[PDB]
C-alpha cells in the first residue's frame, strides 16, 4: 500500500476520491509542492496529460524513490495507461497493490573539455547530435567503451533509450526496443555511407563522440541544445537511477505498440 | 594450457594437424572431414566426442563451417576458435596465412573468452532445431505470402502478412537479418531481433526483445522453419512454433587483439579514424 499520493501535470475528481479514501495528497484555490518536493514526499505520483508532460515529469521523478503512473486524456500512450473514464477503477486496483512495474532507464550526456565537465543534461527518450544549422553535413568519431568503433559523415546521430525507440528514433529508421531492454540504439541521420545501419549496444556501455579540431550541439529530449565548443567531446552513458513506472494488471506493452503503430491485431 | 585439441570443419587442416602434433598436443580430427580429406593414420572422433572431451576445437573453413560445428560444440564445456577463409569473419578470427603464429599465442593462454547464446525452435502440437544465427519462418514456395500470429512471452503481439519472419541472435544480426534491413546487435547483448520479410503493413519495423523472452508463432489451420544453413523443416497443420534461448552457449575464444568493431567496420565498409 501507498501513504502519500502526488498529483502532477478528473484533476478535480481525482483529488476528491483520494482524500475520501484516506490518503495524504500533495498537488502542484491543501498540501502543495514543487515537482521535486512531490518526488521527495510521495510514494505514488499520478501524472495528468498524456506522454507529453509525463516526459517532463519523468526526468525529475526518476531521481526519487517514487512510483509513477500516468492518466492520458483519451488516447493511448506508451507511458500513460489510464483512460479518464476507467481511471478510478484502475487506480483503485493499483492502490490495493495490484500493478505491473516497468523500470525505464535514462541517458546522461556530458560535454567535456579533457576531464572538465562543461555541460550536462539527461534524457528519457534520446540524445541527438546535430549541427547548429540543420541539413548541413557533420563528421564525428564514435568510441564505444573508450575503443574507436567507427566514424561518420551525416546530418547527425540519435542515441535512444528503449523508451525513445518509438519516438524520433523510429521516424529516423531505428528499431523498436522493448521498454526494459538493457540496450541503447545509435541511429544515423542520413549518413553518407549507404551501408550504415542502426547499431544496438549494451546500456552498460559508454559512448564518446569526438569532432574535428577546426557549431555542434546535442539535444536531450528536445530540451534546449547544449553547445559543443572547439576541442570538446561528448560522453553518453546510462544514468544511475531509473523511472519507477507502474501499470494496471491488464497492461500489455505489445497491445500498446501494435495499436499505436497500426500493426495487425488479427487472429485466425 | 589445452591438452586435447580437435580439428573440425568441412590443406589448412593438414598444416594444423602436423603443427599441433609437432608441438606435442594430443590431436583428434572430426571423423567426416578426415575421410573427406582422405587422411591416413590420423585419429578421429565424432563431433560430439570432440565436444565432450577436447579442451579446444579449431574450426577450419570460415563462418559457414563454424555454424555447423557450433550447434554441437555449444552443448559442451569446450573452447572454440575459428580460422577464416582469408577475408574476415564474424565468428572466425584467425588468418589462414598467419594461423600458426596466432594460434600459438592462444595456446599460451593469450585469449579472450566470449559466450554466444543460441536459439531453440520447437514445433508444438500443444520436433526441435537450434541456430546460432537465425530461425526463419517462410513458405515452401519462394516469394509467396504467408499469414501468422506472434506472441511474445505468450502475450499476443501482432499478426503479419508477409514473405516470412527472421528471428536473429546478435551473432546472426550481421547475416541474413542485415540483408533484410535489420539492426546490428553487438555480439554479447542479451537480445534477439524479429525482422519481417516484406510485410504488407508499411509501419512494420524490426523489433528487439530480451533474449530471456519466448516467441510463439501461430498459423491458419507448406509452412517451414529454416535454422541457419540447415534444410527447411516442415510445420504440419495445427502446429505452433515456439522459439527461445538455448540453455547452453558457444564458448568462443578470440585472439587478444580481437576488436568486434574493427571487423564490423571493415566488413561493412564503414569509415575509420578521421582526426
| DSSP labels, A93-132 | HHHTT-EEE--EEEEEEEEEETTEEEEEEEESSEEEEEES
- CA proximity to A124, closest of A179, A167, A163: A163
Specify the 3-state DSSP secondary structure of B166: strand
Is B178 marked as binding a ligand?
yes
Instruction: Give yes or no on whether A1-105+241-268 and A106-240 have one common fold.
Output: no
Which of A141, A153, A181 lies at the smallest CB-CB distance from B273?
Answer: A141
CA distance B171 to B187: 5
- B206 and A257: CB-CB below 8 Å? no
List of residues 6+ apart from A135 with CB closer than 8 A: A155
CA distance A180 to A3: 27
- CA proximity to B129, closest of B220, B224, B41, B60: B224
CA distance A70 to A171: 24
List of residues 6+ apart from A247 with CB closer than 8 A: A69, A81, A99, A100, A101, A102
Is B12 marked as binding a ligand?
no
CA distance B13 to A92: 69
Are the beta carbons of A54 and A245 closer than 8 angstroms? no
Which single residue is written with the C-alpha cell 566488413?
Answer: B267
CA distance A225 to B267: 35
- B207 and A174: CB-CB below 8 Å? no
Neighbours of B19 (CB within 10 A): 15
Which of A139, A150, A170 lies at the smallest CB-CB distance from B270?
Answer: A150
- CA proximity to A267, closest of B220, B202, B153: B220
- A264 and B208: CB-CB below 8 Å? no
**Bridging pattern class, strands A44-48 and A4-8:** parallel
CA distance B158 to B178: 22
Q: Chain centroid to CA B38: how far?
A: 27
| For chain A, domain boundaries | 1-105+241-268, 106-240
- CA proximity to A242, closest of A100, A58, A49, A81: A58
**Is the CA virtual torsion B38, B42, B44, B47 positive or negative?**
negative
Taking each helix axis as running N to C, give the angle between helix A87-95 and helix A11-20, from 0 to 180 degrees, rounded to the nearest 10: 40
CA distance B133 to B173: 7
Torsion of CA A147, A204, B248, B67, to 10 degrees: -40
Phi, then psi, of B226 in degrees rounded to 5 = -110, 120
- A176 and B206: CB-CB below 8 Å? yes
Taking each helix axis as running N to C, give the angle between helix B12-22 and helix B99-107, from 0 to 180 degrees, rounded to the nearest 10: 40
Q: Fold for domain B118-247?
A: Tumour Suppressor Smad4 (2.60.200)
Q: Does the domain formed by B1-117+248-275 have CATH 3.40.50.10330?
A: yes
- B270 and A193: CB-CB below 8 Å? yes
Is B109 marked as binding a ligand?
no
Which of A150, A263, A264 lies at the smallest CB-CB distance from B261?
Answer: A150
Q: What share of chain A is helix, strand, coil (3-state, %, to 5)?
A: 20, 40, 40
Which CATH number does the domain A1-105+241-268 belong to among 3.40.190.10, 3.30.420.40, 3.40.50.10330, 3.40.50.360? 3.40.50.10330
Catalytic residues of B: 63
List of residues 6+ apart from A88 with CB closer than 8 A: A13, A14, A17
Buried b (16+ CB within 10 A) or exposed e, A209-246: bbbeeeebbbbbbeeebbebeeebbbbbbbbeebbbbb
List of residues 6+ apart from B238 with CB closer than 8 A: B125, B221
Phi, then psi, of B48 in degrees rounded to 5 = -60, -45
- B182 and A199: CB-CB below 8 Å? no
User: Which three cell numbers mark B36?
Assistant: 573427406
Please tell me the distance in Å from A210's CA to the nearest CA on chain B. Answer: 9
> End-to-end CA distance of chain A, in Å?
42
DSSP one-letter string for A142-208: EEETTEEEEEEEESEEEEE-TGGGGTHHHHTTPPEE-TT-SEEEEEEES-SSTT---EEEETTS-EE
Phi, then psi, of A43 in degrees rounded to 5 = -90, -25
Q: Which residues of chain A does B178 touch, with a Cβ-Cβ cutoff of 8 Å?
A: 197
Of all residues in chain B, the one with the smallest CA distance to A260 is B203
Catalytic residues of A: 51
Q: Which residues of chain B does A185 touch, with a Cβ-Cβ cutoff of 8 Å?
A: 183
Q: Which residues of chain B does A252 touch, with a Cβ-Cβ cutoff of 8 Å?
A: 155-156
Q: What is the resolution of this structure in A?
A: 2.0
| B26 DSSP β-pair partners | B4
CA distance A226 to A249: 40
Q: Which residues of chain A does B270 touch, with a Cβ-Cβ cutoff of 8 Å?
A: 150-152, 193, 195-196
- CA proximity to B196, closest of B137, B109, B237, B122: B137
Q: Fold for domain A106-240?
A: Tumour Suppressor Smad4 (2.60.200)
User: Which three cell numbers mark A20?
Assistant: 475520501
List of residues 6+ apart from B190 with CB closer than 8 A: A182, B117, B210, B211, B212
Report angle CA A147, A191, B178 to the nearest 5 degrees: 75
Are the beta carbons of A196 and B270 closer than 8 angstroms? yes
Are the beta carbons of A143 and A236 closer than 8 angstroms? no
How many Cα atoms occupy the beta-carbon half-sphere of B163 within 13 Å? 8
Q: How was this structure determined?
A: X-ray
- CA proximity to B61, closest of B33, B26, B28, B100: B33
CA distance A100 to B55: 46
Buried b (16+ CB within 10 A) or exposed e, B53-90: ebbbbbbbbbbbbbbbbbbbbbbbebbbbbbbeeebbb
Q: Which residues of chain B does A254 touch, with a Cβ-Cβ cutoff of 8 Å?
A: 152, 155-158
Are the beta carbons of B36 and B10 closer than 8 angstroms? yes
Torsion of CA B235, B237, B240, B245, to 10 degrees: -10
- CA proximity to B139, closest of B176, B164, B166, B165: B164
Report angle CA A240, A246, A250 to the nearest 5 degrees: 145
Amino acid at each position: 500500500h501507498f501513504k502519500c499520493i502526488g498529483i502532477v501535470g478528473t484533476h478535480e475528481m481525482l483529488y476528491r476520491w483520494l482524500c475520501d479514501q484516506g490518503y495524504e495528497v500533495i498537488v502542484e484555490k491543501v498540501p502543495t509542492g514543487t515537482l521535486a518536493e512531490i518526488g521527495q514526499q510521495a510514494d505514488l505520483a499520478v501524472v495528468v496529460g498524456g506522454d507529453g508532460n509525463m516526459l517532463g515529469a519523468a526526468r525529475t521523478l526518476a531521481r526519487y524513490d517514487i512510483n509513477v503512473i500516468g492518466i492520458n486524456r483519451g488516447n493511448l500512450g506508451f507511458l500513460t495507461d489510464l483512460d479518464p473514464d476507467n481511471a478510478l477503477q484502475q487506480l483503485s486496483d493499483v492502490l490495493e497493490g495490484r500493478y505491473i512495474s516497468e523500470k525505464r532507464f535514462l541517458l546522461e550526456a556530458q560535454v567535456c573539455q579533457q576531464d572538465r565537465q562543461k555541460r550536462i543534461s539527461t534524457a528519457i527518450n534520446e540524445v541527438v547530435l546535430h549541427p547548429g544549422k540543420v541539413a548541413h553535413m557533420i563528421e564525428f568519431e564514435v568510441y564505444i567503451d573508450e575503443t574507436f568503433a567507427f566514424s561518420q559523415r551525416s546530418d547527425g546521430l540519435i542515441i535512444s533509450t528503449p523508451t525513445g525507440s518509438t519516438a524520433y528514433s523510429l521516424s529516423a529508421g531505428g528499431p523498436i526496443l522493448t521498454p526494459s531492454l538493457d540496450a541503447i540504439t545509435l541511429v544515423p541521420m542520413f549518413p553518407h555511407t549507404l551501408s550504415a545501419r542502426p547499431l544496438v549496444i549494451n546500456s552498460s556501455s559508454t559512448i564518446r563522440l569526438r569532432f574535428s579540431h577546426r557549431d555542434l550541439e546535442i539535444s536531450c529530449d528536445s530540451q534546449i541544445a547544449l553547445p559543443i565548443q572547439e576541442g570538446e567531446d561528448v560522453l553518453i552513458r546510462r544514468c544511475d537511477y531509473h523511472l519507477n513506472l507502474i501499470h494496471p494488471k491488464d497492461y500489455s506493452y505489445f497491445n500498446t505498440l501494435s495499436t499505436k503503430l497500426g500493426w495487425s491485431k488479427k487472429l485466425f
